Structures are given as C-alpha cells and as structure tokens.
Amino acid sequence: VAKREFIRGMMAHYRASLPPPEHSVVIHELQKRVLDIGMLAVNKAHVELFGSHVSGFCTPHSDADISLTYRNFSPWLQGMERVDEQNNKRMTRFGKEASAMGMEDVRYIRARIPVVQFTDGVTGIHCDVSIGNIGGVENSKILCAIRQVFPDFYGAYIHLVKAWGKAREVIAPERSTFNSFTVTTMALMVLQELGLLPVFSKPTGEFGELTVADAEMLLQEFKLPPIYDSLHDDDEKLGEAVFFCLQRFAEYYAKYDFSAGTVSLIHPRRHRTVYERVVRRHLELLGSRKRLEWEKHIAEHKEDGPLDENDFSASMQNETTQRPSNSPYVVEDFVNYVNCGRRVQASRVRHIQQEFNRLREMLIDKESELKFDEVFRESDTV
Numbered sequence: 001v002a003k004r005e006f007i008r009g010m011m012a013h014y015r016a017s018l019p020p021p022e023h024s025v026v027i028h029e030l031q032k033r034v035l036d037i038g039m040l041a042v043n044k045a046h047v048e049l050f051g052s053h054v055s056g057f058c059t060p061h062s063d064a065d066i067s068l069t070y071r072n073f074s075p076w077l078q079g080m081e082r083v084d085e086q087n088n089k090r091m092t093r094f095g096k097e098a099s100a101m102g103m104e105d106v107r108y109i110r111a112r113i114p115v116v117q118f119t120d121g122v123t124g125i126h127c128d129v130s131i132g133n134i135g136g137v138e139n140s141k142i143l144c145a146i147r148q149v150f151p152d153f154y155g156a157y158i159h160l161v162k163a164w165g166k167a168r169e170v171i172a173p174e175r176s177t178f179n180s181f182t183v184t185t186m187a188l189m190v191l192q193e194l195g196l197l198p199v200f201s202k203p204t205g206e207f208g209e210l211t212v213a214d215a216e217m218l219l220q221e222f223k224l225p226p227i228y229d230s231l232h233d234d235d236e237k238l239g240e241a242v243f244f245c246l247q248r249f250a251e252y253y254a255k256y257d258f259s260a261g262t263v264s265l266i267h268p269r270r271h272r273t274v275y276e277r278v279v280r281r282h283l284e285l286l287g288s289r290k291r292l293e294w295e296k297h298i299a300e301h302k303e304d305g306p307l308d309e310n311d312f313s314a315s316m317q318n319e320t321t322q323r324p325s326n327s328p329y330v331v332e333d334f335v336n337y338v339n340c341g342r343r344v345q346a347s348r349v350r351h352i353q354q355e356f357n358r359l360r361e362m363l364i365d366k367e368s369e370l371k372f373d374e375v376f377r378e379s380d381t382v
C-alpha cells in the first residue's frame with residue numbers, strides 16, 4: 001500500500017512538472033528576445049538553446065541555457081588574451097543591451113566561462129547566456145535523443161532523480177555538489193548497466209568525443225525490453241518500472257567503486273587511469289588544433305602576436321584542469337571528456353555518498369514504509 005501510493009504520487013509529480021502545451025512557444029519567443037539583445041551586441045548574432053529545455057528533462061521552473069555565437073567565432077581562440085578581451089567586450093554590450101531591452105537582474109559574470117545571467121522580463125524564466133558553449137549544445141542534443149526513446153520512462157526517471165537530487169542537495173552546483181547534468185549522466189549510466197540504455201562505446205568525433213550522430217545511430221538500434229510496451233497507457237505499471245530503476249540507481253551509487261572506475265556513457269566503469277590516458281590523447285588532439293587556430297588568427301592580426309607560449313600553456317592548463325582523473329568523482333562529459341563532476345571536493349564525498357546509502361534504504365529496505373513527501377524534501381546539511 002505504501003509503495004503503491006509512493007509510485008502514484010511520484011508519477012503525479014512528474015505529470016505536474018511537464019511543460020504545459022504552450023511552453024514550446026514561450027521558449028521560442030524567449031529565444032527571439034535573446035537574439036534581439038544579441039544582435040545589438042555582436043555581429044551575426046546567433047543564439048542557441050541548450051540544457052533541459054533541449055533535452056526535455058525540464059520542469060516549468062528550469063532555467064534557459066543559451067549559447068551565443070557571432071561572426072568569426074571560433075571555440076579554439078579561447079585562451080588567447082586579445083580574443084578573450086574582445087569576448088568580454090561582446091558580453092559587456094550584451095549585458096547592457098539586455099538591461100535596455102528590459103531583462104531583469106542582468107549580471108555579467110567574469111569566470112571559467114564569461115557568462116551573462118538575467119531573468120527574462122516577460123516570463124520570469126532564468127537565463128544563462130555564454131559565448132560558444134559548443135559542448136553544451138551537443139550533449140543536450142544527445143540527451144534529447146536519449147529521452148525520445150520513451151519520454152515518460154526516461155523523463156520520469158530523470159525527473160525523479162533530479163527532484164530527488166535537487167530537493168536533497170545532491171544537485172546543488174552553487175553549493176559545492178553535483179550539477180543536474182552530472183547527475184543526469186550518472187542516472188543514465190545505471191540504465192546502461194541494466195541494459196535499459198545503450199553503451200555509446202564507439203565515439204567518432206575529431207578529438208575522440210561522442211557526437212550527436214554517434215548517439216542517434218545507437219539509439220535508433222536500441223530497443224527496450226518487450227514489457228516496456230505495456231507501460232505507455234498504465235501509470236501504475238510504468239511507475240513500477242521507474243521505481244525499479246530508482247532502486248537500482250540508489251543501490252548502484254551506494255556501492256560503486258569510484259576509487260577505480262569512472263562514470264561514463266561511452267565506457268561505463270572505465271578505470272580512472274585509463275580515463276587519464278583518454279584525456280591525454282584528447283588534449284593532445286585539442287592542443288594541436290588550438291595551436292593551429294591561434295597561429296592563423298595571429299597571421300591575420302599580427303599585432304595580436306607573436307604566439308605567446310605562456311598564454312598557450314595556461315590555456316592548455318585550463319583544459320587539463322577541466323579533466324582530472326584523480327578527483328573524488330570522475331563523471332565524464334561524453335562530448336569533450338570534461339570531468340563535469342570534478343568540482344565536488346573531497347570533503348563532500350561524504351554527504352552525497354551517504355544520501356545515496358539513504359535513498360536505497362528508503363526505496364529498498366524500508367519499501368513498505370514509503371512516503372513521497374519524506375524521500376523528496378529539503379535537506380540543509382552542506
């Protein structure tokens with residue numbers, strides 16, 4: 001009876017978090033507004049959505065992630081001081097034109113990603129605008145593709161993992177733990193090990209990353225178990241399947257050896273030191289491409305030269321720093337081998353790692369004792 005009510009409520013909650021019918025249009029108009037601001041700021045403004053609004057793993061409270069690009073934008077020129085400063089000047093104007101258009105709480109943040117955040121003056125949606133977030137654009141298209149296999153199954157599962165994580169401070173970026181995307185990736189890996197998602201074992205990007213095309217290819221061949229086809233018109237049955245995966249998810253990350261293995265949708269459980277060599281190869285490829293592009297920019301803007309090896313070295317150092325193999329968690333972004341879980345400090349390894357021991361205790365051991373509003377609520381701890 002407790003289990004049956006828990007599953008009922010949990011699906012209820014998922015069903016109440018699905019974007020309303022008109023929401024597609026809202027988000028499209030939002031994009032149009034951002035592009036208007038962008039056009040005032042940069043030449044050949046281009047605005048591209050990513051994040052959960054692209055993947056579809058969103059609530060009506062989820063923010064809007066937008067990648068801004070412009071004429072002669074190049075991802076490889078990041079690190080070069082003159083291009084960096086040029087981008088800062090682009091984001092400065094973006095900020096100023098955003099306030100003028102009537103965006104609220106406009107904030108230009110100078111960071112590991114020069115970013116402009118604002119609250120849309122029309123719909124109240126929070127917006128995170130960054131220059132050339134190519135990795136975000138791509139891995140959001142891969143996630144959307146995954147969700148499409150059976151939206152309510154993956155959606156519900158990912159929703160509840162996210163609701164759980166958010167509500168439980170497992171996903172608390174500005175609070176030193178994981179972000180939505182890291183947690184999504186973890187939850188998706190557990191489905192791979194259950195045979196409920198395919199293993200993206202053969203990436204074919206220029207730098208060895210997984211591409212949208214790699215992902216779509218596999219997801220077209222992947223079939224869920226036959227029993228899954230009775231779950232489309234029965235929320236009690238589907239909820240049972242989702243609940244099963246949540247138990248397996250809670251379980252997995254309560255017992256998973258991160259001291260050896262990594263989380264990866266490309267190579268589940270790949271050893272840290274193998275990831276290390278994978279990163280080294282990736283960055284050797286990224287590094288040389290980068291060098292070629294800096295050298296081309298420099299040939300065309302001689303006063304921006306000569307190629308300053310300190311600058312290059314520090315740029316490469318930032319790429320290396322995005323990808324430690326030797327950190328509390330190694331959760332691999334499949335599009336760039338970024339260790340999107342690198343930010344979780346050794347001291348947090350406790351919180352998370354208990355609250356997983358705790359999710360699985362409620363879902364499995366104390367199954368007969370289940371209450372929706374006790375598993376999924378605020379946890380002021382970190």
Ligand SMILES: O=c1ccn([C@@H]2O[C@H](COP(=O)(O)OP(=O)(O)OP(=O)(O)O)[C@@H](O)[C@H]2O)c(=O)[nH]1
Pocket residue numbers: 050051052053057058059062063065135136137139140179180181182184333340341
């Ligand atoms: O470490 C990261 C963080 C973020 N990202 C990329 O930026 C996107 C937006 O970052 P968000 O924090 O908004 O996550 P999200 O959109 O998946 O989920 P909610 O907002 O609904 O909670 C992520 O979905 C991913 O595309 C990364 O690639 N790596």
Ligand SMILES: [Mg+2]
Pocket residue numbers: 050051052053062063064065
């Ligand atoms: Mg988002």
